[PDB]
Write a protein that binds this ligand. Structure first.
Ligand SMILES: CCCCCCCCCCCCCCCCCC(=O)OC[C@H](CO[C@@H]1O[C@H](CO[C@H]2O[C@H](CO)[C@H](O)[C@H](O)[C@H]2O)[C@H](O)[C@H](O)[C@H]1O)OC(=O)CCCCCCCCCCCCCCCCC
Ligand code: CLA
Ligand code: CLA
Ligand code: CLA
Ligand code: CLA
Ligand code: CLA
Ligand code: CLA
Ligand SMILES: CCCCCCCCCCCCCCCC(=O)OC[C@H](CO[C@@H]1O[C@H](CS(=O)(=O)O)[C@@H](O)[C@H](O)[C@H]1O)OC(=O)CCCCCCCCCCCCCCC
Ligand SMILES: CC1=C(C#C/C(C)=C/C=C/C(C)=C/C=C/C=C(C)/C=C/C=C(\C)C#CC2=C(C)C[C@@H](O)CC2(C)C)C(C)(C)C[C@H](O)C1
Ligand SMILES: CC1=C(C#C/C(C)=C/C=C/C(C)=C/C=C/C=C(C)/C=C/C=C(\C)C#CC2=C(C)C[C@@H](O)CC2(C)C)C(C)(C)C[C@H](O)C1
Ligand SMILES: CCCCCCCCCCCCO[C@H]1O[C@H](CO)[C@@H](O[C@H]2O[C@H](CO)[C@@H](O)[C@H](O)[C@H]2O)[C@H](O)[C@H]1O
Lengths: 180, 160, 171, 153, 180, 42
C-alpha cells in the first residue's frame, strides 16, 4: 500500500513493479497522467544520452581528434570551437537516426501503435548480447541505473564547469572553492 | 547597398547613437555615483551602445534618417531580416494549428465534446502539443490520405 | 566448482572441453559474449602476441640489413614509427588486412558452427596429426604466456627506452 | 480519464493501420532488428555487413594514400592524380580523379592505411600532470577538504 | 555454532543492557545478541557478515603492520627507498609517493574484483558459501575445528578493528599509537 | 489532489491564463537575455 522508496507516501498505482528499477518512486504522480511506456522510453533515452555525455566530457579532455578545432580540454569551449558544419551534421544525423530507429513512429500518438513496440526497445542489439533470458533482466536493471547515475553526473558536471570554468578532472585536481 | 548605405558607416546612425548616449549621460549627471539610479543609467548606456554596435556589425542597411531598413524581397544577403524569422513563425504557427485541430477531433470523438472543450483533458492536450513538432509531414500525410479536406457534398452550405 | 577458483562456481558458458579451459572466468565475460567469438579472439591474440614477443627478442638479437639504415637504430615502437614513415608498415598492414577479410569470413563460419575457433586448417608440415588436443593446449598456453610477455616487454620499453634483452642486460 | 502519451493512435482518434507487422528476431551488425523481406537477413546478414566492411577498409588502404608515386628522380615522390593530363576531352585536359571523391589534402588531413596519419594524429593529453590526490603540489578537492578540517578561524 | 547457547546463538547477550533483537536468530557465527538499532531486520545478513569478516581481516593485518612500523622493523632495502620514519602517516605518504601503496591498491582491487565480488554476488544469490570463505587454508589449520576457528577469527577481527582505530587516533593525539 | 480541483484547474480560462503567462514569460526572458534582436543573426 506504501511506496518502497518513500515509505510515508502511497505506492504509485500505475507502477506495478514490472519495469526494471521500479521502487515505487513517483511522489508527484506523473505516471497517473502520462503513460509509463512513454515515460520509460524517455527515461532510457535521457539516460543513454547522459551516459554518452559523461563519457565524452571525461574522455575528450584527455584524448582529442587531430586539429586546433578539436583541441579543447574544456567541454563548453569545445562546443563552440568544434566545426559548426560538423555540429550541424551531427544534428541532422541524430534526426535521421530518431526517424529510422523509431520507424516513422515518433509522436505521442503513434509511437507505440505496434503492440510489439516495447518501451525503450529500438531494435538495437548489434552483438546480440541481450538474447540471453538469464542475464536480460540484470542488463535491463543495469541500464536503467546507469542512465539515472549518468543523468545526475552529467548535470553536476555541466554546472560545476559553469562555476569553476575548468574541466572536470582539472577542477578535481586543482580545486578552488567558489568565491562570488 | 541595394538602395541605401550600410549602417556601420552611416553618419546618421552615429549621430543617433551619440544623441541617445548624451541624453542618458545628461540624465546620469544628476545622480550620485554608485547609487541605484546611476547604476541603472550606466546599464542603459551600455545596452544602447551594445545595440548600436551589434546593428552596425549585423550588415543592416540604414537610410538618410539613420535607422535600419529591411530588404524583404527574397535576397539571400538579407534572409535574416524577414525570411528566416518568417520560417520560424510558420513553424510555430503550424505547430499550434495542427495540435489544435488534433485536439478538436479528439474531443469530437468523446462522450461530451463540449465538456472536453470547456474543461480540457490536459493529458491528451499535452500529447497533441508534443505531436506538433513534425506537423508539416503529418499535415501533408493527412492531406494525401484524404482525412484533411472534406468533400463538397459533406459540408453544409446556404441556399443560393 | 571452478578448478582454478575453488570458491567460485564453474562458469556455465565454460563446459571445459575447450583447450585451456580451467573454469577461469570470475567476471563472467562468457555469459555476456558468445564463447566461440571469445575463443577466436583469444587464439588471435595468442598468435599475434607470440609473434610480437618473438619479434621483439629477435630484433634485439639481430636486425636485417637496410632496415637498420631506414630506422636509424630505433627499436620497438620507435622502429614502428620510423618504418611507418618509410612505408613498410603500410605493406604489412595491407597484407594483414587482406588476410583479415578471410578472417572475418572464417569468424562468421565459426559463429555458424561450421568451423572450430581458430582452425584455419594450416598444418603444412603435419605437426598437428598425432595429438591435436595436446598441441592445442600447448598453443593456448604459449599464447597466454606470450601475451603477458609482450605486455612486459612493451611496458619495459616505455619505462626505460631499452628492449627486452638490453633491459635484462642493463636494468 | 485518459492517460496521455499512450502512443496508440486509436486512443487519440488518429489514423492508424488495422494489422500491425509482426516483429521477427533477426539482427544485422550495423543494421537493425525489424520487419524485412524474405531472405533479406540471409542475403544481407551480419556476415554480409562485416565482410563488406572489411573489404571497404582494405580498399580504403590504397585510397587513403592515393597518388602517383614515382622513383624516376631517385626518391619516392608523390604527385596528385590531378596533374596527369588526359587526351581526347577537349578543353578539359585535367579531369576528376579519386581525389575528387576523397579530398584529404584540401582539408589538411594526413590520411593513412589506418585512419590517422603522422601529421593528423590523435592527441593524448595527460590530465594528471604532476598532481596527487593528497599532499601534492596541486591543491585537489581532497586537499581542500583536509585544509578546511584543519583550518583556524 | 561453537559453544552454542553459551558463547553464541539464540538466547545469548554479550551486553544485557540491550535486549537481543528477534532478528538475530543465532544462525550466524559471532551472533551474541548485539544489535540495538535492529539493522538485522532490513540488512542482507550474508552481505553484512562478509563485510564484517573483511573489515576484521584488514584490521588484523593493519594492526600487525602498524606495530612493526612503530617498532621499526623494516624489510631489507625498505628504509633506503622510503625512509627511517616510524610515524605511520609519514610512512603512508612516503609509500604513496614512491608507488608502493599504488601497487598494493592495484592488486587488492584486482583480487576484490576477481574473487570477492563474484563470490559475494553468488553468496547473495544463494550459492550457500559461508561468509568470508575463499578456500584459503593452505596449511590446513582449520580442519580440526572449523567453527571454533570461525568464532575466534570473528572475535579477533573485531578486537583488531577497535585496536587499529584506537592506535590511529592515539598517533593523531600524542604521536604514539600506544597512546600510553 | 482533489480531482474536482484538478478539473477546475483544467477549465478553459485557467489554462488560457497559465499558458499565456508562461508564453509571456518565455518571450520576456528571451528579450531579457537576448535583447534588441531586430533580425535573425546571419
Ligand atoms: C567502492 C568500493 C571500493 C572502495 C575501495 C577503496 C577503499 C579505501 C582504501 C583507500 C584507498 C585510497 C584510494 C586513493 C587512490 C588514489 O587517489 O590514487 C592515486 C594513485 C596515483 O598513483 C600515485 O601517484 C602518486 C602521484 O604522486 C604525487 O602525489 C603523491 C601523493 O598524492 C606525492 O605528493 C608525490 O610527491 C606527487 O608526485 C605517485 O607518484 C605514484 O604514482 C602513486 O602513489 O593511484 C594509483 O596509484 C593508481 C593505481 C591504479 C588504481 C587501481 C584501482 C582499481 C584496481 C581494480 C583492479 C583492476 C586494476 C587494473
Ligand atoms: C554523407 C556523407 C558525408 C560527407 C561527404 C561528409 C563530409 C565532411 N564531414 Mg562529415 N559527417 C557525416 C557524413 C558526411 N560527412 C555524418 C553522417 C556525420 C554525423 C555522424 C558527420 C559528422 C561530421 C562532423 C562532426 C564533422 C564532419 C566534417 C566533415 C568534413 C571533413 C573534411 C575532411 O577532410 O575530413 C577528413 C577526416 C577524416 C576522414 C577523419 C574521420 C574521423 C571520424 C571520427 C572517423 C567534410 C565536409 C568536419 C568538418 O566539417 O570540418 C570542417 C567535422 O567536424 N562530419
Ligand atoms: C512581388 C514579386 C516578387 C516575388 C514573389 C519574389 C520572390 C522571390 N524573390 Mg524576389 N524580388 C522582387 C520581387 C519578387 N520576389 C523584386 C522586385 C526584386 C528587385 C528589387 C527582387 C529581388 C530578388 C533577389 C535579388 C532575389 C530574390 C529572390 C526571391 C526568392 C527568394 C526565395 C528563394 O529563392 O527560394 C528558393 C528556395 C526553394 C525553391 C526551396 C527551398 C527548400 C528548403 C526549405 C531550403 C523568391 C521566389 C532570391 C532568389 O534566389 O530568387 C530566385 C534572390 O536572390 N528576389
Ligand atoms: C513577432 C511577430 C509576429 C506576430 C506577433 C504574429 C502574429 C500573428 N500572425 Mg504571424 N507572421 C509573422 C510574424 C508574426 N506574426 C511573420 C514574420 C510572418 C511571415 C512568414 C507571419 C506570417 C503569418 C501568416 C501567413 C499568418 C499569420 C497570422 C498571424 C496571426 C494569427 C496566428 C495564429 O492564429 O496562429 C495560430 C495558428 C493557427 C490558427 C493555424 C492556422 C494559421 C497558420 C498561420 C498556418 C501556418 C501553416 C500554413 C501551411 C501556412 C500557409 C501560408 C500561405 C497560405 C501563405 C497573429 C496575430 C495569421 C493571420 O493573420 O490570420 C488571419 C496567418 O494566417 N502570420
Ligand atoms: C616497499 C618496500 C620495499 C622496498 C622499498 C624494498 C627495496 C629493496 N629491497 Mg626489498 N623487501 C621487501 C620490501 C621492500 N624492499 C619485503 C617486504 C621483503 C621481505 C622481507 C624484502 C626482502 C628483501 C631482500 C631479502 C632483499 C631486498 C633487497 C632490496 C633492494 C634491492 C631489490 C631490487 O633490486 O628489487 C631494494 C632497495 C635486496 C638488497 O638489499 O640487496 C642488497 C635483498 O637482498 N628486499
Ligand atoms: C579498488 C578496487 C576494489 C574493488 C572493486 C572493491 C570491491 C568491493 N569492496 Mg573493497 N576494498 C578495496 C578495494 C576494492 N574493493 C581496498 C583496497 C580495500 C582496503 C584494503 C577494501 C576494503 C574493503 C572492505 C573492508 C569492504 C570492502 C567491500 C567491498 C565490496 C562492496 C563494495 C561494492 O560493491 O562497491 C561497488 C559500488 C556500488 C555497489 C555502488 C557505488 C558506486 C561507486 C560510486 C563507484 C565504484 C567505483 C569502483 C569501486 C572503482 C574501481 C573500478 C575498477 C575495478 C574497474 C566489493 C566486493 C565491502 C564488502 O561488503 O565486502 C564484501 C567491505 O566490507 N572493501
Ligand atoms: C588470528 C586470526 C584468524 C583466525 C582465527 C582465522 C581463522 C580462519 N581463517 Mg583466516 N584470515 C586471517 C586471520 C585469521 N583467520 C587474516 C588476517 C586474513 C587476511 C589475510 C585471513 C584470511 C582468510 C581467508 C581468505 C580465508 C580464511 C579462512 C579461515 C578459516 C580456515 C582456517 C584458517 O585459516 O585458520 C587460521 C589459523 C590460524 C592460526 C591463523 C593465525 C596465524 C597467526 C599469524 C599465528 C578460519 C575460520 C578460510 C575460510 O573459509 O574462512 C571462512 C578462508 O578462505 N582466512
Ligand atoms: C535540423 C534538423 C532537421 C534534420 C533532421 C531530419 C529528420 C526529420 C525526421 C522527420 C520524420 O521523422 O518524419 C516522421 C514521419 C511520420 O509521419 C507520420 O506517419 C504516419 C504513418 S507512418 O508513420 O508513416 O507509418 C501517419 O499516419 C502520420 O499522419 C504522419 O504524421 O515519417 C513519414 O511519414 C514520411 C517521412 C518522409 C520520408 C522522406 C524523408 C527523406 C529525408
Ligand atoms: C548497449 C550495447 C552496446 C553498448 C554500449 C555502450 C557504448 C555503453 C556505454 C555505456 C556508458 C558510456 C556508460 C556511462 C556511464 C556513466 C556514468 C554512470 C557516470 C556517472 C557519473 C557520476 C555519478 C558522476 C560524477 C561526478 C560529478 C558529476 C562531479 C565530479 O566532481 C565528480 C564525478 C565525475 C564523480 C554495444 C555497442 C556494446 C552493442 C551491444 O549489443 C548493445
Ligand atoms: C603454424 C605452424 C607453424 C608455425 C609456426 C610458427 C611461426 C610458430 C611461432 C611461434 C612463436 C614465435 C612463439 C613465441 C612464443 C613467445 C613467448 C611464449 C614469449 C614469452 C615471453 C616472455 C615470457 C617474456 C618476457 C619478458 C618480459 C615480460 C620482459 C623482458 O624485459 C624480459 C622477458 C624477456 C623475460 C609451422 C611453420 C611450424 C608449420 C606447422 O604445420 C604449423
Ligand atoms: C559527398 C557528396 C554529398 C552531396 C550532398 C551534400 C549536400 C549538402 C552539402 C552542404 C555543404 C557542406 O557543408 C559545409 O559548409 C560549411 C560552411 O562553413 C563548411 O565549412 C568549412 O568547410 C571546409 C572544411 O571542410 C573549410 O575549408 C571551409 O573553409 C569551412 O567553411 C563545411 O566544410 C561543411 O559543413
Amino acid at each position: 500500500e506504501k511506496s518502497a522508496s518513500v515509505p510515508f507516501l502511497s505506492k504509485p498505482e500505475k507502477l506495478d513493479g514490472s519495469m526494471a528499477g521500479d521502487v515505487g518512486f513517483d511522489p508527484l504522480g506523473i505516471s497517473y497522467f502520462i503513460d509509463v511506456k512513454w515515460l520509460r522510453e524517455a527515461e532510457l533515452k535521457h539516460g543513454r544520452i547522459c551516459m554518452l555525455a559523461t563519457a565524452g566530457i571525461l574522455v575528450q579532455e584527455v584524448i582529442h581528434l587531430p586539429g586546433p578545432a578539436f583541441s579543447s580540454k574544456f567541454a563548453l569551449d569545445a562546443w563552440s570551437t568544434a566545426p559548426r558544419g560538423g555540429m550541424v551534421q551531427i544534428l541532422i544525423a541524430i534526426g535521421l537516426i530518431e526517424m529510422v530507429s523509431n520507424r516513422f513512429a515518433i509522436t505521442a500518438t503513434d509511437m507505440f501503435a505496434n503492440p510489439n513496440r516495447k518501451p525503450g526497445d529500438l531494435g538495437f542489439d548489434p552483438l546480440s548480447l541481450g538474447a540471453n533470458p538469464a542475464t536480460r533482466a540484470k542488463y535491463e536493471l543495469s541500464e536503467v541505473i546507469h542512465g539515472r547515475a549518468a543523468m545526475m553526473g552529467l548535470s553536476g558536471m555541466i554546472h560545476q564547469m559553469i562555476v569553476s570554468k575548468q574541466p572536470v578532472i582539472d577542477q578535481l585536481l586543482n580545486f578552488k572553492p567558489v568565491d562570488a | 547597398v541595394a538602395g541605401l548605405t550600410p549602417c556601420k558607416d552611416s553618419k546618421d546612425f552615429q549621430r543617433r547613437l551619440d544623441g541617445s548616449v548624451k541624453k542618458l549621460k545628461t540624465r546620469l549627471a544628476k545622480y550620485e555615483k554608485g547609487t541605484p539610479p546611476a547604476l541603472a543609467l550606466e546599464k542603459q548606456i551600455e545596452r544602447t551602445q551594445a545595440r548600436f554596435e551589434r546593428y552596425g556589425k549585423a550588415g543592416l542597411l540604414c537610410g538618410t534618417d539613420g535607422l535600419p531598413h529591411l530588404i524583404t524581397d527574397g535576397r539571400w544577403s538579407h534572409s535574416g531580416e524577414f525570411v528566416i524569422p518568417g520560417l520560424f513563425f510558420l513553424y510555430i504557427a503550424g505547430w499550434i494549428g495542427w495540435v489544435g485541430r488534433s485536439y478538436v477531433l479528439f474531443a469530437r470523438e468523446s462522450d461530451k465534446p463540449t465538456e472536453k472543450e470547456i474543461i480540457l483533458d490536459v493529458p491528451a492536450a499535452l500529447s497533441f502539443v508534443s505531436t506538433g513538432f513534425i506537423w508539416p509531414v503529418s499535415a501533408f500525410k493527412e492531406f494525401t490520405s484524404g482525412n484533411l479536406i472534406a468533400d463538397e457534398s459533406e459540408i453544409t452550405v446556404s441556399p443560393r | 566448482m571452478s578448478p582454478s577458483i575453488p570458491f567460485l562456481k564453474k562458469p556455465d558458458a565454460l563446459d571445459g572441453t575447450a583447450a585451456g579451459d580451467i573454469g577461469f572466468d570470475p567476471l563472467g565475460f562468457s555469459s555476456l559474449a558468445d564463447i566461440k567469438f571469445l575463443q577466436e579472439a583469444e587464439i588471435k591474440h595468442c598468435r599475434i602476441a607470440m609473434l610480437a614477443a618473438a619479434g621483439s627478442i629477435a630484433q634485439d638479437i639481430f636486425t636485417f640489413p637496410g632496415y637498420s639504415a631506414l630506422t636509424g637504430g630505433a627499436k620497438m615502437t620507435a622502429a614502428h614509427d620510423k618504418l611507418v614513415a618509410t612505408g613498410t608498415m603500410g605493406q604489412i598492414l595491407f597484407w594483414v588486412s587482406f588476410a583479415e577479410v578471410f578472417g572475418t569470413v572464417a569468424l562468421f563460419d565459426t559463429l555458424d558452427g561450421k568451423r572450430a575457433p581458430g582452425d584455419f586448417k594450416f598444418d603444412p608440415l603435419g605437426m598437428g596429426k598425432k595429438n591435436m588436443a595436446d598441441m592445442q593446449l600447448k598453443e593456448i598456453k604459449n599464447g597466454r604466456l606470450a601475451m603477458l610477455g609482450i605486455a612486459g616487454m612493451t611496458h619495459g620499453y616505455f619505462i626505460s627506452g631499452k628492449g627486452p634483452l638490453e633491459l635484462l642486460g642493463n636494468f | 480519464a485518459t492517460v496521455g502519451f499512450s502512443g496508440v493512435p486509436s486512443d487519440f482518434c488518429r489514423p492508424a493501420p488495422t494489422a500491425f507487422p509482426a516483429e521477427p528476431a533477426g539482427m544485422t551488425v550495423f543494421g537493425a532488428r525489424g520487419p524485412r523481406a524474405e531472405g533479406h537477413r540471409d542475403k544481407f546478414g551480419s556476415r554480409h555487413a562485416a565482410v563488406s566492411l572489411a573489404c571497404a577498409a582494405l580498399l580504403w588502404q590504397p585510397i587513403s594514400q592515393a597518388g602517383m608515386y614515382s622513383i624516376d628522380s631517385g626518391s619516392l615522390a608523390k604527385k596528385s592524380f590531378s596533374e596527369m593530363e588526359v587526351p581526347g576531352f577537349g578543353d578539359a585536359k585535367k579531369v576528376p580523379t579519386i581525389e575528387s571523391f576523397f579530398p584529404f589534402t584540401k582539408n589538411g588531413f594526413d590520411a593513412s592505411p589506418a585512419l590517422f596519419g603522422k601529421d593528423s594524429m590523435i592527441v593524448f593529453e595527460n590530465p594528471l600532470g604532476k598532481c596527487g590526490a593528497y599532499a601534492s603540489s596541486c591543491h585537489t578537492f581532497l586537499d581542500e577538504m583536509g585544509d578546511m578540517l584543519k583550518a583556524t578561524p | 555454532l561453537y559453544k552454542e547457547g553459551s558463547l553464541q546463538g539464540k538466547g545469548v547477550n554479550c551486553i544485557p543492557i540491550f535486549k537481543r533483537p528477534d532478528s538475530l536468530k543465532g544462525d550466524a557465527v559471532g551472533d551474541m545478541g548485539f544489535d540495538p538499532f535492529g539493522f538485522s531486520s532490513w540488512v542482507d545478513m550474508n552481505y553484512v557478515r562478509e563485510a564484517e569478516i573483511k573489515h576484521g581481516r584488514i584490521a588484523m593485518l593493519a594492526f600487525a603492520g602498524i606495530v612493526v612500523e612503530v617498532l621499526g622493523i623494516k624489510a631489507p632495502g625498505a628504509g633506503k627507498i622510503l625512509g627511517s620514519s616510524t610515524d605511520i602517516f609519514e610512512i603512508h605518504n612516503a609509500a604513496v609517493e614512491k608507488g608502493s601503496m599504488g601497487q598494493i591498491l592495484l592488486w587488492c582491487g584486482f583480487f576484490e574484483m576477481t574473487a570477492g565480488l563474484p563470490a559475494m554476488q553468488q553468496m547473495l544469490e544463494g550459492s550457500g558459501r559461508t561468509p568470508g570463505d575463499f578456500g584459503f587454508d593452505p596449511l590446513g589449520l582449520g580442519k580440526k575445528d572449523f567453527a571454533q576457528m570461525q568464532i575466534k577469527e570473528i572475535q579477533n577481527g573485531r578486537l583488531a578493528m577497535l585496536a587499529v582505530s584506537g592506535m590511529v587516533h592515539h598517533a593523531l593525539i600524542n604521536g604514539k599509537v600506544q597512546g600510553l | 489532489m482533489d480531482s474536482n480541483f484538478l478539473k477546475y484547474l483544467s477549465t478553459a480560462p485557467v489554462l488560457l491564463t497559465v499558458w499565456l503567462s508562461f508564453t509571456a514569460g518565455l518571450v520576456i526572458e528571451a528579450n531579457r537575455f537576448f535583447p534588441d534582436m531586430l533580425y535573425f543573426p546571419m
